[PDB]
Amino acid sequence: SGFRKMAFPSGKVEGCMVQVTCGTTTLNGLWLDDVVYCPRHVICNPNYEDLLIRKSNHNFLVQAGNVQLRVIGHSMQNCVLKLKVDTANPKTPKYKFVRIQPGQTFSVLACYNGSPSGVYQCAMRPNFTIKGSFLNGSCGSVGFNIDYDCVSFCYMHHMELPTGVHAGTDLEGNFYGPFVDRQTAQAAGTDTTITVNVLAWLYAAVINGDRWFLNRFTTTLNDFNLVAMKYNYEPLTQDHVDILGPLSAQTGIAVLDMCASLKELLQNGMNGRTILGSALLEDEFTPFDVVRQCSGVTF
């Protein structure tokens, strides 16, 4: 029993975190094989090709623990700088670089000066930002998922927006969201609630014995989406209904039967009650996260 916001074990990622320094800027890098990946803004309206051409290998100081790595090459890929080093990381895990979609969750290993400080779970919001917990010096911290023994790196931290939310790239340097890596007026767009995730969390509550919100009613996909659009909820697709199939079979509550429960919660509120210790509808657990936590999958 119990249901917590759970992150993946961070050990395989901790063994990859390094400190990158260029002039006065210090941030975090990810050391995989003989390459250190970090935000390109470590070098400085920026013309990154012009700033980079003026740098030599010895201008980049890379520290792994109490050991200085020597940079033997450098290149830029989108908004990420790739620093070739002479030493392959002996702690390099089995890994892939994957780009995630809004609604997907991942673990973040927040780092300062190449040293991991904490791990938390979060979701890529529909507006492509993350509601993270980052201070200055956290740039280069990464987001990941673990599948069997393979680490899938999906996020690298670059900046904080004026509302306190965060923006970054995948490990190929492509931003999530209409953001740019420069000091200019940028803002998070209007956000929405991840509907399939709220439904998954309602199924996690039922499995754990919280059933007060269930009702005898069902709905159609179209009627549910007309209601959900009114409350700034993301549209629910047939793919989402299909993905919730296993949870629907385990609890005996059809997906549109759970949608009718959700419609009632949106129109009436919780009336002083809580679901899994929360007075708000939680949207940062995916259907797979619910299945994994209620089954004990290990890595």
Ligand X SMILES: O=C1N(c2cncc3ccccc23)CC[C@@]1(O)c1cccc(Cl)c1
Residue 157 annotated among the catalytic residues of the structure: no
Q: Which is nearer to ligand X, 77 or 92 (CB)?
A: 77
Among 14, 34, 160, 191, binds ligand X (CB under 6 A): 160
Q: Write out the two tokens for 32.
A: 């995989």
Interface with ligand X, residue 135, by CB under 6 A: yes
Q: Crossing angle for the helix pair 195-207 and 255-268, nearest 10 degrees?
A: 100
Cβ–Cβ under 8 Å, residues 137 and 27: yes
Q: How many CA atoms lie within 13 A of 79 on its CB side?
A: 23
Residues 239, 282: Cα–Cα separation, whole Å = 20
The pattern of x and - marking residues 124 through 153 that bind a second copy according to CB under 8 A reads: -------xxxxx-xx---------------
Nearest by Cα to 136 from 39, 52, 229: 39
Catalytic annotation, pick one of 38, 111, 139, 259: 139
Q: Indicate which single residue of 100, 119, 150, 243 sits in contact with Cl ion (rule: CB under 5 A).
A: 100
Q: Restricting to residues 85-124, which ones interact with a second copy according to CB under 8 A?
A: 109-113, 115-122
Amino acid at 238: Q
Which of 164/245 has CB closer to a second copy?
Answer: 164
For the chain, how far is it from start to end, CA to CA, in angstroms? 20
Nearer to ligand X, 4 or 182 (CB): 182
Q: List the single partner that 104 binds among a second copy, ligand X, Cl ion, none, CB under 5 to 8 Å by kind.
A: Cl ion
The site partner of 6 among ligand X, a second copy, Cl ion, none (C-beta below 5 to 8 Å per kind) is a second copy
Q: Does 159 bind ligand X (CB under 6 A)?
A: yes
Residue 79 among the catalytic residues:
no
Can you tell me the distance from the alpha carbon of 183 to that of 100, in angstroms, rounded to the nearest whole number? 26
Output the CA torsion sign for 222, 270, 188, 139.
negative
Contacts with ligand X by CB under 6 A lie at 1, 41, 134-136, 138-139, 158-160, 181-183
